[PDB]
Design an enzyme around this catalytic site. Structure first.
Site, PDB file in Angstrom:
ATOM      1  N   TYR A 122       0.516  -1.295   0.006  1.00 36.98           N
ATOM      2  CA  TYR A 122      -0.134   0.259  -0.156  1.00 36.98           C
ATOM      3  C   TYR A 122       0.716   1.425   0.031  1.00 36.98           C
ATOM      4  O   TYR A 122       2.238   1.474   0.532  1.00 36.98           O
ATOM      5  CB  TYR A 122      -0.793   0.169   1.627  1.00 36.98           C
ATOM      6  CG  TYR A 122      -0.041   0.217   2.966  1.00 36.98           C
ATOM      7  CD1 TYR A 122      -0.298   1.464   3.145  1.00 36.98           C
ATOM      8  CD2 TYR A 122       0.533  -0.533   3.725  1.00 36.98           C
ATOM      9  CE1 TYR A 122       0.420   2.456   4.149  1.00 36.98           C
ATOM     10  CE2 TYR A 122       0.803  -0.154   4.718  1.00 36.98           C
ATOM     11  CZ  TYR A 122       1.154   0.911   4.264  1.00 36.98           C
ATOM     12  OH  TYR A 122       1.485   1.560   5.908  1.00 36.98           O
ATOM     13  N   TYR A 163      -8.874   9.354  11.569  1.00 33.95           N
ATOM     14  CA  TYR A 163      -8.026  10.004  12.849  1.00 33.95           C
ATOM     15  C   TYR A 163      -9.291  10.642  13.682  1.00 33.95           C
ATOM     16  O   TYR A 163      -9.033  11.446  14.635  1.00 33.95           O
ATOM     17  CB  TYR A 163      -7.147  10.324  12.583  1.00 33.95           C
ATOM     18  CG  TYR A 163      -5.634   8.833  11.959  1.00 33.95           C
ATOM     19  CD1 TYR A 163      -5.870   8.078  13.258  1.00 33.95           C
ATOM     20  CD2 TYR A 163      -5.897   8.698  11.052  1.00 33.95           C
ATOM     21  CE1 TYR A 163      -4.604   7.092  12.724  1.00 33.95           C
ATOM     22  CE2 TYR A 163      -5.345   7.685  10.494  1.00 33.95           C
ATOM     23  CZ  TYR A 163      -4.499   6.811  11.681  1.00 33.95           C
ATOM     24  OH  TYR A 163      -3.335   6.032  10.983  1.00 33.95           O
ATOM     25  N   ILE A 166      -7.485   1.606  10.696  1.00 31.09           N
ATOM     26  CA  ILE A 166      -9.031   1.936  10.952  1.00 31.09           C
ATOM     27  C   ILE A 166     -10.160   1.421  10.451  1.00 31.09           C
ATOM     28  O   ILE A 166     -10.388   0.646   9.333  1.00 31.09           O
ATOM     29  CB  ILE A 166      -8.285   3.592   9.963  1.00 31.09           C
ATOM     30  CG1 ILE A 166      -7.465   3.356   8.354  1.00 31.09           C
ATOM     31  CG2 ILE A 166      -7.435   4.790  10.380  1.00 31.09           C
ATOM     32  CD1 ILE A 166      -7.359   4.768   7.892  1.00 31.09           C
ATOM     33  N   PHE A 191      -5.764   6.326  -0.308  1.00 28.28           N
ATOM     34  CA  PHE A 191      -4.801   5.225  -0.225  1.00 28.28           C
ATOM     35  C   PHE A 191      -5.244   4.801  -1.479  1.00 28.28           C
ATOM     36  O   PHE A 191      -6.155   4.787  -2.337  1.00 28.28           O
ATOM     37  CB  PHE A 191      -4.858   3.554   0.726  1.00 28.28           C
ATOM     38  CG  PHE A 191      -4.704   3.717   2.557  1.00 28.28           C
ATOM     39  CD1 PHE A 191      -5.412   5.050   2.983  1.00 28.28           C
ATOM     40  CD2 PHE A 191      -3.812   3.753   2.791  1.00 28.28           C
ATOM     41  CE1 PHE A 191      -5.326   5.027   3.709  1.00 28.28           C
ATOM     42  CE2 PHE A 191      -3.440   4.105   4.522  1.00 28.28           C
ATOM     43  CZ  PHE A 191      -4.327   5.253   4.990  1.00 28.28           C
ATOM     44  N   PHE A 196       3.742  10.120   1.132  1.00 23.16           N
ATOM     45  CA  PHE A 196       3.715   9.194   0.470  1.00 23.16           C
ATOM     46  C   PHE A 196       4.162   8.382   2.158  1.00 23.16           C
ATOM     47  O   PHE A 196       5.120   8.232   2.233  1.00 23.16           O
ATOM     48  CB  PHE A 196       3.186   8.635  -0.558  1.00 23.16           C
ATOM     49  CG  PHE A 196       4.086   8.111  -1.067  1.00 23.16           C
ATOM     50  CD1 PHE A 196       4.948   9.539  -1.585  1.00 23.16           C
ATOM     51  CD2 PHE A 196       5.464   7.120  -1.408  1.00 23.16           C
ATOM     52  CE1 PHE A 196       6.364   8.997  -2.882  1.00 23.16           C
ATOM     53  CE2 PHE A 196       6.559   7.296  -1.960  1.00 23.16           C
ATOM     54  CZ  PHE A 196       6.657   8.120  -2.979  1.00 23.16           C
ATOM     55  N   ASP A 197       3.133   7.443   2.401  1.00 21.96           N
ATOM     56  CA  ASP A 197       3.995   5.975   3.241  1.00 21.96           C
ATOM     57  C   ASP A 197       3.749   5.107   2.338  1.00 21.96           C
ATOM     58  O   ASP A 197       2.433   4.681   2.068  1.00 21.96           O
ATOM     59  CB  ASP A 197       2.864   6.108   4.741  1.00 21.96           C
ATOM     60  CG  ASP A 197       3.377   4.748   5.133  1.00 21.96           C
ATOM     61  OD1 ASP A 197       4.361   4.769   5.682  1.00 21.96           O
ATOM     62  OD2 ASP A 197       2.082   4.332   5.066  1.00 21.96           O
TER      63      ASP A 197
END
Lengths: 120, 87, 104, 149
Positions: free
Chosen positions: A37, A93, A67, A110, A47-48
């Site tokens: 992802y 969140y 989440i 995502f 981005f992560d």
């Protein structure tokens, strides 16, 4: 042009398939799920990525270990599918947000690739 | 520092900061300047002294502590002495 | 940079610390206060090597890395008598017993 | 169960720093207070790990289960700080008593069926056999919290 897959149908988690998967099956509550992802804020640049960490992302579906949006979204994915999710604060969140990297009321986006899912 | 003397069985005299020796409960009671241990030899009593040095130094250390090493050949007699000395 | 020492002569062994920057003289003073002999009546050694009063423990080769509280470095001491200095003589510690079989 | 993780769902970035000479086993108490082993840390190793507010940990020798300290105490529990700064978990040896240290070494040298063959007072055989034990520790700590009103 994307599909609402919330119960309340508040567009709080929109989805678009990008790469269609194989097989008819999808991951069920408690399954152990494997993904890659990319993940970023909506109004945002950085981005992560699991590709960076060099290891796939592994969690238990439906068990509140990610989440609310992911428990919902991933559960609709077939093996090998790639999907985009766009998530409202309520389904992540919220007002609190999660410093350092999640602001208050942050809208997330995502890309997910379901690699595999197995039974507990 | 004022000092105390600890004589091993084989007759070695060990002179150490009194504060350090008080690490031993047994010695603490025994000081109620020189102490003779008729049943502890120098290869052991020398190692006990080193432990006082270690303890008094590295209490209060808050970041990193090294290991107090014990050689196989002394472990068992060191155990007996530690138990006798209450430390 | 503290260093931890055994100062050894005959059957006598002093435990003490000092700075790497402290001098051999300073150390002899510590000796003087315990064994009641003046610095001019003492000679200090690192192994078989005499140590000048004005060198630092540092310069004499002692380091904190090699003179730890749990494994202190040894300093040899010898006293003068009448007109002449005794040779360096350190009585060894006892020899440990044979390792018991269940510890081999 | 008094000592347990709370299910806060509030992420907290921790740095595990092993400043002990031992291989360290991090132990996570779960939501029922039941200990769970986590990957071990070589001596000298540091790692950013993922955890959560109010999650209880302790740390042990991965081999002997000897107890270690973290931030000079037995338990570690991440509190959130503002602005999200990481929480450091500094793991060290305690200053063991000489006796406890000697027991540590004899245990590593003698197989436990052979303590009985050592030539020692009976009390020390007992002491040798009284191995360090997470469950006994957890019980001891439970009573310390309780007794702090």
């Amino acid at each position: 042009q994307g599909e609402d897959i919330t119960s309340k149908k508040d567009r709080g988690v929109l989805k678009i398939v990008k790469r269609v998967g194989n097989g008819e099956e999808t991951p069920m509550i408690g399954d152990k799920v494997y993904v890659h992802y990319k993940g970023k804020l909506s109004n945002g640049k950085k981005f992560d990525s699991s590709h960076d960490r060099n290891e796939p992302f592994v969690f238990s579906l439906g068990k509140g270990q990610v989440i609310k949006a992911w428990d919902i979204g991933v559960a609709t994915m077939k093996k090998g599918e790639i999907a985009h999710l766009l998530i409202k604060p309520e389904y992540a969140y919220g007002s609190a947000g999660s410093l350092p990297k999640i602001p208050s009321n942050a809208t997330l986006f995502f890309e997910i690739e379901l690699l595999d899912f197995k039974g507990e | 520092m004022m000092y105390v003397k600890l004589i091993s069985s084989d007759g070695h005299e060990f002179i150490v900061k009194r504060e350090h020796a008080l690490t031993s409960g047994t010695i603490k009671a025994m000081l109620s300047n020189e102490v003779n241990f008729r049943e502890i030899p120098s290869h052991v009593l020398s190692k006990v002294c080193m432990y006082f040095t270690y303890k008094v130094r590295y209490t209060n250390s808050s970041t990193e502590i090294p290991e107090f090493p014990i050689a196989p050949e002394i472990a068992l007699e060191l155990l007996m002495a530690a138990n006798f000395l209450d430390c | 940079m503290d260093v931890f020492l055994m100062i050894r002569r005959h059957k006598t062994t002093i435990f003490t610390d000092a700075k790497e920057s402290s001098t051999v003289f300073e150390l002899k003073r510590i000796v003087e206060g315990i064994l009641k002999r003046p610095p001019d009546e003492q000679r200090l050694y690192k192994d078989d090597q005499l140590l000048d009063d004005g060198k630092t423990l540092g310069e004499c080769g002692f380091t904190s890395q090699t003179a730890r509280p749990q494994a202190p470095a040894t300093v040899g001491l010898a006293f003068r008598a009448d007109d002449t200095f005794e040779a360096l003589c350190i009585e060894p510690f006892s020899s440990p017993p044979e390792l018991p079989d269940v510890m081999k | 169960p008094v000592l347990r993780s709370v299910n806060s769902r509030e992420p907290s970035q921790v740095i595990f720093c092993n400043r002990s000479p031992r291989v360290v086993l991090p132990v996570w108490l779960n939501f029922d207070g039941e200990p769970q082993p986590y990957p071990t840390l070589p001596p000298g190793t540091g790692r950013r790990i993922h955890s959560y507010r109010g999650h209880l940990w302790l740390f042990r020798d991965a081999g002997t289960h000897d107890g270690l300290l973290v931030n000079q105490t037995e338990l570690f529990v991440p509190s959130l700080n503002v602005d999200g700064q990481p929480i450091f978990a500094n793991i060290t040896l305690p200053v063991y008593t000489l006796k406890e240290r000697c027991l540590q070494v004899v245990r590593s040298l003698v197989k436990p069926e052979n303590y009985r063959r050592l030539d020692i007072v009976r009390s020390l055989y007992e002491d040798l056999e009284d191995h360090p034990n997470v469950q006994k520790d957890l019980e001891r700590l439970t009573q310390e919290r309780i007794a702090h009103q």
